[PDB]
């Protein structure tokens, strides 16, 4: 009776995951862009630093 | 999601013929190598035939030579198997199988441990 | 100014215009080629130090190339200094260095040969890197120094170390210093010849003629089987091409090395053509 | 300074110990053992001696003519093998053990060999091929109850090569059968026709005392070929 | 009845897909079509580190951004200083086949695991001053793929027996088991706040897990073959995945679907490692054609190539202050780029 129990578990999981609050993709895109633009002047691999403060040269 | 679905099957008298079809959804069809497998009552998972990306390389097993044929349609995304001159020792459940990687010439796809890219299967019964 | 006077006790003059021209272009090309070789062996040094075998092989080949280039430039230097005015000064010093570096060349080739046999006969064996480098550098650049200095010391005070018309070793009815080059050279070819036979025993396993031919076509420039033709230049006068085949074959040594030693390789060609592309 | 000297001292000591370890590492030959449940690799392991629960791997060590060998067997793993099989791209050799007295578990062995041969990370690795259970094959062929033609039709059109070397005191039928079985694997091996690795086939039994010597000679040949390829003499 | 249960599952999946489609009103490209490119990004190797005798499988940066750990297929685990290229520690192992490493946030412990199905926790600050094995954790039924600390007393592991586990080091026992995958499990990554984590598992599926309760929360699909690597976006609201179909993709946890894909027509090999930069604008990927690629996460363009290795690239990492990037390959060398 392993198949019956496996199917019951699968159905219970899908019922648990089918009622969850969701939002639009535009909100997520906006949040990602805003975060990227808040921390853009402190990212040394995109905005390099003078050679006198680099610890590797 | 990756989906393989089967069609065709049933009850045939000895000496008959029939045709098994498989439809695929969720990946690029032509980058892959494809196989047929079957399960007999009280045994393990066997291997029957295999075909490559273009269709120019084909290979079979010993006991089906001269009776079974393998085909592949890429525009319509379908795999076919033609069965002629059946025997009672062919009663089984039939699955299609896809290799795990693209652009390659090896397989590791007969395992019982719930191999992922495999269909649900169809039943063929050959009796009088 | 023929290239044959290294091994030649005596030259017939009838063929004098025949030989010289070959030499004076041959050497030329060689110099250029050898330079290229060295550069490459320094550019990819970090990508070739994989296992012990590649390490030792690369050491031997770079040393061969360097020694050949130096000896060739000294041959040019000593081929254009007139002895009709100065009986000493350059025309002795030049002689010395010529000798020394040619000897070094030969001994390095011997190393390569022995190494290859050690890689076929005793397959399960290993030694430290530093011991091998030490023995190689102590018997490759070590014996030439001893032989050269002993020769010059034992002969120069009596003044029988130079010829009369060209800047090179003499021999006439007395002291014969030329043997201090001819004996230690030929009897390295006799070793390397044997080594080649061994390799053909391991490759004649069964289109096989192509494989055996290419195998015999790579070793001949490096292990130096061409110089054997001088055994007839010491024991003949003109015959057929004893004073002209020798020049043509032995002058193109560096060009042959660059044609086969580095360009016909598999991995190094891939790295060079990837860097170029 | 006065706090950087100690760092260099520690680095120097560590490097000394690493050299002593490299010497030992580069003088040991590593082999991988593969088989199935009905084969007898357990017996081969038990016979290669003098010449924690849920443990995932097993190791065995032996010595032939003062050369050390390490050999690895895989224990508690699942059936799928397309991920861990990559941890073995630098061993000297694989040892593939096959039973040859089934007639219906031989196609699966053929498929597994064909899959090992053609993988991308194992194209420079060589195979030593063992075929156990020769007594069972002899008895089954002389008995005559089961026919090979039911699984491999081509056996109906096979003759022993005229240049064969049968062992003395042997029925010709056994020679035919065993030569056919060997030809299958060799055909798969030479089908690609590349020339960068080789198969070495053999016949063995349950109680035989020569397997280690066979492995010794084959590994010797492998290393010679590697050395010759390093010198471009191929 | 089996058929009734399967049909019910199919109906639930259709409802899931319809709800997901109803929540997409725009694409990432269209919104992000009015910004500035990052331009050509060039990097040079500053340090190169030597000492290993075989291939490398993993590395891991420390929390001070100066020390790092590395593990190789010859039974050794080395701890380096990258400001000076020194060696601070070398540890020998019992089983050579090792596949993962981790470095505790306090600098006191290290960990490792592999094909012997055992996790080993090592102490680095003994009174006698010598490294000795402090604990061994056993109970998995397959090899270990990755492990990551939480504190000096709790640790999470993932194995190829389809399950994940949380362990209490002092007692020596499991405390929660996460089950529900179908194939092997290949990678995991911890949230910045250490209350959730994500797992990728070799059947074209990804899952999010809750540590304090032990159940699953969401599943995501979309790849076509095995998923090989994973990591979190810096704010804990997105994550990036790479697989063997030669494609990277980005997933968001609140809209519950996929946003952007990174691919090209000349790429026909897999992906081994992924990682983000400090601001979330540069995505770094490692490939099986001997070099690494640098993508822009909002425009879906290529901005740079790092190409100095000889064999397959296996490990990649970015520091906790953005300064350096370290990579390690199958030819036994590590490299540091800035």
Which residues form the domain of D100?
A: 5-230
Query: Which uninterrupted H or E stretch holds D6?
Result: helix D5-25
A neighbour chains, 3+ CB pairs within 8 Å = E
**Burial class of residue C214 (count of CB atoms within 10 Å of its CB; 0-12, 13-18, 19+):** middle
Tokens read off for C239: 């015959």
Backbone angles phi, psi at D65, to 5 degrees: 50, 45
Query: D11–E160: do the CB atoms touch at under 8 Å?
Result: no
Instruction: Please name the residues between 118 and 157 in chain D that touch chain B, using a CB distance below 8 Å.
Output: 118-120, 150-153
Residues of chain C with a following break (C to N over 2.5 Å): 206
Residue located via tokens 């069972």: D136
Contacts of E244 in chain B (CB under 8 A): 100-102
Contacts of B102 in chain E (CB under 8 A): 225, 244-245, 268
CA distance C96 to E187: 70
Q: Using CB atoms, pick whichever of C120, C128, C218 lies closest to residue D232.
A: C218
Residue located via tokens 């026919």: D147
Contacts of E204 in chain B (CB under 8 A): 2, 116
Supply the DSSP string of B48-88, one letter for each residue. Answer: -EEE-SSS--EEE-GGGTTTEEEEEETTTTEEEEEEES--G
CA distance D82 to D120: 12
Task: List the CATH number of the domain containing D141.
Answer: 3.40.50.300
Per DSSP, E117 falls in state S
CA distance C221 to C231: 17
Of C65, C240, E96, C66, the closest CA to residue D91 belongs to: E96
Of C263, C257, B107, E193, the closest CA to residue D117 belongs to: B107
Tokens read off for E15: 């409802």
Q: Using CB atoms, pick whichever of B2, B101, B103 lies closest to residue E204.
A: B2
Sort residue D17 into left (φ over 0), alpha (ψ -120 to 50) or beta.
alpha
Of E49, E93, E86, the closest CA to residue E71 belongs to: E93
Interface test with B, best of D36, D38, D78, D82 (most B CBs within 10 A): D82
Q: Which residues contact E35 (CB under 8 A, 6 or more apart)?
A: A33, E298, E299
**Burial class of residue B39 (count of CB atoms within 10 Å of its CB; 0-12, 13-18, 19+):** middle
The structural domains of chain E, ordered by start, are: 2-337 (2.130.10.10)
CA distance D17 to D65: 28
For C160-171, letters b (16+ CB in 10 Å) and e give bbbbeebbbbbe
Of E14, C243, E240, E84, the closest CA to residue D3 belongs to: E84
Of D164, D95, D110, D101, the closest CA to residue D134 belongs to: D101
Of D89, C154, B80, the closest CA to residue E73 belongs to: D89
Q: Using CB atoms, pick whichever of E46, E180, E279 lies closest to residue A39.
A: E279
For D130-165, letters b (16+ CB in 10 Å) and e give bbbbbeebbebbeeeeeebeebbeebeeeeeeeeee
Q: Using CB atoms, pick whichever of E180, E254, E338 lies closest to residue A56.
A: E338
The full length of chain B comes to 128
Of D103, D101, D166, D104, the closest CA to residue D135 belongs to: D101
CA distance C253 to chain D (A): 19
CA distance C30 to C46: 27
Nearest CA in chain E to A1: E2
Task: List the CATH number of the domain containing C80.
Answer: 1.20.1070.10
Nearest CA in chain D to C112: D231
CA distance A16 to chain E (A): 8
Residue located via tokens 């000096």: E152
CA distance E131 to chain D (A): 14
Q: Which residues pair with D59 in a beta bridge?
A: D72
Strand residues in C10-163 grouped as ranges (E): none
What strands, in cross-sheet order, belong to the sheet with E164-168? E144-149, E154-159, E164-168, E173-178
Tokens read off for A14: 């899908």
Which residues form the domain of C175?
A: 3-276
CA distance B28 to B102: 10
Tokens read off for D118: 């053609």
Q: Which residues contact A16 (CB under 8 A, 6 or more apart)?
A: none
- How many domains would you assign to chain C? 1
Of D114, D131, D128, D116, the closest CA to residue D177 belongs to: D131
Backbone angles phi, psi at C61, to 5 degrees: -65, -40
Contacts of C126 in chain D (CB under 8 A): 26-27
Residue C46: alpha-carbon gap to chain centroid: 27
CA distance E239 to E255: 13
Q: Using CB atoms, pick whichever of D67, D220, D230 lies closest to residue C53.
A: D230
Provide the sign of the torsion angle of the four alpha carbons C192, C196, C197, C201, taken in this order.
Answer: positive
End-to-end CA separation in angstroms for chain D: 56
Q: Using CB atoms, pick whichever of C120, C126, C219 lies closest to residue D26.
A: C126
Query: Which uninterrupted H or E stretch holds E47?
Result: strand E45-49
CB of E84 within 8 Å of a chain D CB? The answer is yes
Query: D8–E51: do the CB atoms touch at under 8 Å?
Result: no
Interface test with B, best of E204, E243, E288 (most B CBs within 10 A): E204
Q: Using CB atoms, pick whichever of B27, B103, B114 lies closest to residue E224.
A: B27
Of E110, E113, E105, E101, the closest CA to residue E71 belongs to: E101
Of E85, E40, E47, E76, the closest CA to residue E326 belongs to: E47
Instruction: Please name the residues between 127 and 146 in chain C that touch chain D, using a CB distance below 8 Å.
Output: 128
Of E337, E335, E328, the closest CA to residue E71 belongs to: E328
CB of C124 within 8 Å of a chain D CB? The answer is yes
Query: E19–A22: do the CB atoms touch at under 8 Å?
Result: yes
CB of E311 within 8 Å of a chain D CB? The answer is no
Long-range CB contacts (< 8 A, 24+ apart) of C165-169? C165/C83, C166/C1, C166/C5, C166/C83, C167/C78, C167/C79, C167/C81, C167/C83, C167/C90, C167/C91, C167/C94, C167/C95, C168/C5, C168/C6, C168/C78, C168/C95, C168/C98, C169/C95, C169/C99
CB of C54 within 8 Å of a chain D CB? The answer is yes
Cβ proximity of D156 and D188 under 8 Å: no
Cβ proximity of E5 and A3 under 8 Å: no
CA distance E33 to E49: 42
B neighbour chains, 3+ CB pairs within 8 Å = D, E
- CATH superfamily of domain region B3-102: Immunoglobulins (2.60.40.10)
Tokens read off for E256: 């519950």
Per DSSP, C243 falls in state T
Contacts of E183 in chain B (CB under 8 A): 114, 116
Rg (CA), chain C: 20
- How many domains would you assign to chain D? 1
Nearest CA in chain E to D8: E86
Q: Using CB atoms, pick whichever of D79, D108, D152 lies closest to residue B113.
A: D79
Q: Which residues pair with B59 in a beta bridge?
A: B50
| B/A Cβ contact: 3+ pairs below 8 Å | no
Nearest CA in chain A to E217: A17
Contacts of C112 in chain D (CB under 8 A): none
CA distance C50 to C267: 12
Per DSSP, D167 falls in state P
Q: Which residues pair with E221 in a beta bridge?
A: E205
CA distance E47 to chain B (A): 36
| A/C Cβ contact: 3+ pairs below 8 Å | no
Q: Which residues pair with E130 in a beta bridge?
A: none
Cβ proximity of C151 and C161 under 8 Å: yes
Cβ proximity of E160 and E185 under 8 Å: yes
CA distance E160 to E115: 10
Technique employed here was cryo-EM
Angle, CA D72 vertex, CA D67 and CA D74 arms, to 5°: 175
Query: A20–E218: do the CB atoms touch at under 8 Å?
Result: yes
Cβ proximity of E307 and E264 under 8 Å: no
CA distance C10 to D59: 72
Provide the sign of the torsion angle of the four alpha carbons A13, A19, A25, A27, taken in this order.
Answer: negative
Sort residue E162 into left (φ over 0), alpha (ψ -120 to 50) or beta.
left
| D/E Cβ contact: 3+ pairs below 8 Å | yes
CB of C120 within 8 Å of a chain D CB? The answer is yes
Cβ proximity of E310 and E332 under 8 Å: no
Contacts of E245 in chain B (CB under 8 A): 102
Q: How far is CA D80 from CA B37, B48, C85, E176, E323, in A?
A: 17, 20, 89, 26, 41
Residues in chain A whose Cβ is within 8 Å of chain E:
3-4, 7-8, 10-11, 13-15, 17-18, 20, 22-33, 35-36, 39-40, 42-46, 54-57
Q: What angle, rounded to 10 degrees, do the helices at C52-79 and C16-43 form?
A: 140
Resolution of the structure, angstroms:
2.8
């Amino acid at each position: 009776t392993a198949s019956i129990a496996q199917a019951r578990k699968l159905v219970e999981q899908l019922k648990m995951e089918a009622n969850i609050d969701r939002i639009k993709v535009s909100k997520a895109a906006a949040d990602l862009m805003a975060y990227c633009e808040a921390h853009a002047k402190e990212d040394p691999l995109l905005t390099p630093v003078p050679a006198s403060e680099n610890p590797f040269r | 999601q990756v989906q393989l679905q089967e069609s065709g099957g049933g009850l045939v008298q000895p000496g008959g013929s029939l045709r098994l079809s498989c439809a695929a959804s969720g990946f690029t069809f032509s980058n892959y190598k494809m196989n047929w497998v079957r399960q007999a009552p009280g045994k393990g998972l066997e291997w029957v035939s295999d075909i490559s990306q273009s269709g120019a390389s084909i290979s079979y097993t010993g006991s089906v030579k001269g009776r079974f044929t393998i085909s592949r349609d890429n525009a319509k995304n379908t795999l076919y198997l033609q069965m002629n001159s059946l025997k009672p020792e062919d009663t089984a459940v039939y699955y299609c199988a896809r290799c795990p990687a693209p652009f390659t010439r090896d397989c590791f796809d007969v395992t019982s441990t719930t191999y992922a890219y495999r269909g649900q299967g169809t039943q063929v019964t050959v009796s009088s | 100014t023929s290239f044959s006077i290294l091994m030649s006790p005596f030259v017939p003059s009838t063929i004098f215009p025949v030989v010289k021209w070959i030499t004076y272009v041959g050497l030329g090309i060689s110099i250029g080629s050898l330079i290229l070789c060295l550069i490459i062996e320094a550019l990819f040094w970090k990508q070739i130090k994989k296992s012990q075998t590649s390490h030792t092989r690369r050491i031997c080949m770079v040393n061969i190339a360097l020694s050949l280039l130096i000896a060739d430039v000294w041959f040019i230097v000593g081929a254009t200094v007139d002895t009709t005015v100065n009986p000493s000064g350059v025309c002795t010093a030049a002689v010395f260095f010529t000798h020394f570096f040619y000897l070094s060349l030969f001994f390095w080739m011997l190393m390569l040969g022995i190494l290859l046999a050690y890689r076929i006969i005793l397959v399960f064996h290993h030694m430290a890197q530093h011991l091998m480098m030490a023995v190689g550098f102590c018997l490759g650049y070590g014996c030439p120094l001893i032989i050269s200095v002993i020769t010059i010391a034992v002969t120069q005070p009596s003044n029988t170390y130079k010829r009369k018309d060209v800047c090179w070793l003499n021999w006439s009815n007395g002291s014969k210093p030329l043997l201090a080059f001819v004996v230690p050279a030929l009897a390295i070819v006799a070793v390397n010849f044997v080594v080649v036979l061994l390799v053909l025993t391991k490759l004649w396993r069964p289109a096989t003629i192509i494989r055996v031919g290419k195998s015999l076509l790579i070793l001949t420039p490096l292990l130096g089987l061409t110089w054997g033709f001088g055994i007839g230049t010491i024991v003949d006068s003109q015959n057929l091409a004893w004073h002209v085949i020798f020049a043509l074959l032995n002058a193109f040594q560096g060009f042959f090395i660059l044609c086969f030693g580095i360009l016909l390789d598999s991995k190094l060609r891939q790295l060079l053509f990837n860097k170029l592309s | 300074s006065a706090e950087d000297k100690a760092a260099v001292e520690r680095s120097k000591m560590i490097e000394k110990q690493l050299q002593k370890d490299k010497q030992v590492y580069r003088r040991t030959l590593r082999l991988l053992l593969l088989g199935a449940d009905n084969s007898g690799k357990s017996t081969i392991v038990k016979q290669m001696r003098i010449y924690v629960k849920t443990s995932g791997i097993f190791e065995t060590k032996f010595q032939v003519d003062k050369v050390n060998f390490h050999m690895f067997d895989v224990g508690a793993q699942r059936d799928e093998r397309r991920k861990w099989i990559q941890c073995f791209n630098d061993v000297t050799a694989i040892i593939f053990v096959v039973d040859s007295s089934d007639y219906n578990r031989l196609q699966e062995a053929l498929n597994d060999f064909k899959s090992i041969w053609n993988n991308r990370w194992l194209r420079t690795i060589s195979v030593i091929l063992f075929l156990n259970k020769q007594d069972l094959l002899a008895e089954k062929v002389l008995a005559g109850k089961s026919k090979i033609e039911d699984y491999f039709p081509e056996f109906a059109r096979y003759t022993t090569p005229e240049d064969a070397t049968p062992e003395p005191g042997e029925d010709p039928r056994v020679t035919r059968a065993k030569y056919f079985i060997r030809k299958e694997f060799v055909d798969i091996s030479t089908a690609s026709g590349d020339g960068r690795h080789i198969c070495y086939p053999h016949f063995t039994c349950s109680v035989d005392t020569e397997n280690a010597r066979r492995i010794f000679n084959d590994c010797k040949d492998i290393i010679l070929q590697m050395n010759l390829r390093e010198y471009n003499l191929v | 009845e089996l058929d009734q249960l399967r049909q019910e599952a199919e109906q639930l999946k259709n409802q899931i897909r319809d709800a997901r489609k109803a929540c997409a009103d725009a694409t990432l490209s269209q919104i992000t079509n009015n910004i500035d490119p990052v331009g050509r990004i060039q990097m040079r190797t500053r340090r190169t580190l030597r000492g290993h005798l075989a291939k490398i499988y993993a590395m891991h940066w420390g929390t001070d951004s100066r020390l790092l750990v590395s593990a190789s297929q010859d039974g050794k685990l080395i701890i380096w200083d990258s400001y000076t290229t020194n060696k601070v520690h070398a540890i020998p192992l019992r089983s050579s086949w090792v596949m993962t490493c981790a470095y505790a946030p306090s600098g006191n412990y290290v960990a490792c695991g592999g094909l012997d199905n055992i996790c080993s926790i090592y102490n680095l600050k003994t009174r006698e001053g010598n490294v000795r094995v402090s604990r061994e954790l056993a109970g998995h039924t397959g090899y270990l793929s990755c492990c990551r600390f939480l504190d000096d007393n709790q640790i999470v592991t993932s194995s190829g027996d389809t399950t994940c586990a949380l362990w209490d080091i002092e007692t020596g026992q499991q405390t929660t088991t996460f089950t529900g995958h179908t194939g092997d499990v290949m990678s995991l990554s911890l949230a910045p706040d250490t209350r959730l984590f994500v797992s990728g598992a070799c059947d074209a599926s990804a899952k999010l897990w809750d540590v304090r309760e032990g159940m699953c929360r969401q599943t995501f699909t979309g790849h076509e073959s095995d998923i090989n690597a994973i990591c979190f976006f810096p704010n804990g609201n997105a994550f990036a995945t790479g697989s063997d179909d030669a494609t990277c993709r980005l997933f968001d946890l609140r809209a519950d679907q996929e946003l952007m894909t990174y691919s090209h027509d000349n790429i026909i090999c897999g992906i081994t490692s992924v990682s983000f930069s400090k601001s979330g604008r540069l995505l770094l990927a490692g490939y099986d054609d001997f070099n690494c690629n640098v993508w822009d996460a909002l425009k879906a363009d290529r901005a740079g190539v790092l190409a100095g290795h000889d064999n397959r690239v296996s490990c990649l990492g970015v520091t906790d202050d953005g300064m350096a990037v370290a990579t390690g390959s199958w030819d036994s060398f590590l490299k540091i780029w800035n």
